[PDB]
Paper text:
The catalytic domains are structurally similar to each other and to OTUD5 (Huang et al., 2012) and S. cerevisiae Otu1 (yOtu1) (Messick et al., 2008), root-mean-square deviations (rmsds) being from 0.6–1.0 Å. Catalytic triads are in competent conformations, as observed for pOTUD5 in complex with a Ub suicide probe (Huang et al., 2012). UBDs do not always influence linkage specificity, at least for diUb substrates, as shown for OTUD3, where the removal of the UBA domain did not change its ability to cleave Lys6- and Lys11-linked diUb. Importantly, the amino acid sequence in the loops varies significantly between OTUD family members, in particular in the His and V loops, indicating changes that may account for the observed differences in linkage specificity. Substitution of the His loop of OTUD3 by the corresponding sequence in OTUD1 (mutating R178YGE to LSNG) rendered the protein significantly less active in comparison to the wild-type (WT) enzyme and affected its ability to target Lys11-linked, but not Lys6-linked, diUb, even at very high concentrations. Hence, we engineered an OTU domain with a unique specificity profile against diUb.
Mechanistic and structural studies of three closely related, unstudied OTUs with distinct cleavage profiles revealed four mechanisms for achieving linkage specificity, namely (1) the use of additional Ub-binding domains (UBDs), (2) specific recognition of a ubiquitinated sequence, (3) the use of a conserved S1’ Ub-binding site on the OTU domain itself, and (4) the use of an S2 site enabling DUBs to bind longer chains in a linkage-specific manner.
Residue numbers in the entry:
A (entry chain A), B (entry chain A): 50 to 190
The structure:
Amino acid sequence: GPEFVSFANQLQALGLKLREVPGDGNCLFRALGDQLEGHSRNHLKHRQETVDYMIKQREDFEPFVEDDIPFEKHVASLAKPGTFAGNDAIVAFARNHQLNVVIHQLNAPLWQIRGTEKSSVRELHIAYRYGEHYDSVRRIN
Amino acid sequence: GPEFVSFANQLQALGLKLREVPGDGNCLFRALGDQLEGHSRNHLKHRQETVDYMIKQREDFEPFVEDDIPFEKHVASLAKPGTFAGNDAIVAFARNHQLNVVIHQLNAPLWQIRGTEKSSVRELHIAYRYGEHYDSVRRIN
């Protein structure tokens, strides 16, 4: 259908704008931290707490791991600062914090990862982009 | 990917909500009227003005018509109250009013019909749904 010409335009139509985080493997936790706390300075803590939750809830998270890769290897790699995180990390963070994460993408359907079974919870917004990069999505005014 | 369970939830995540218009063929002009003016009472006028614009700009709109259907037949049918309108009517209305129309759809990419070549213009929001039905999309707070 009739597409937006830029991601900035798409967000702007929704009264939203990007808050970019650096192009390294810590981007998801920086973006989620920015959403949760208004800044990304606790990204190492969020990475560690997210891995801790995944381990505590191993039976829930082993299904996410790409086959023939041991769960231990997956979470050990994720524990290292700079390791790019994926959807399973978003699920873990969302469940740990009992909230939802809405994911924006240029000319793609808006996604929602729900951390609870509840009906009215806190909702965080991030943007998925090239490679494995995530940014924070904030209100304009 | 991870989809919203309802259209209401999807809009709510964006701070938006549906304002339903009746399930008849006047829905697009009622929805556009609601967006433009805050109410749908001028839907007959918007239909007539939209057809007038399409006729004035025939060379621009003939390409939209499904082949072997005469342009005259298309616009004559569209002029009748109750005739369901399509994308070409949105383009015509947007160009006539020199604005943009953003179209929401459940678990589909957000669309944008741009009425001008400009960079900063007024933006109207509607929702496309089952059949040929459109509703108005408004801010929650």
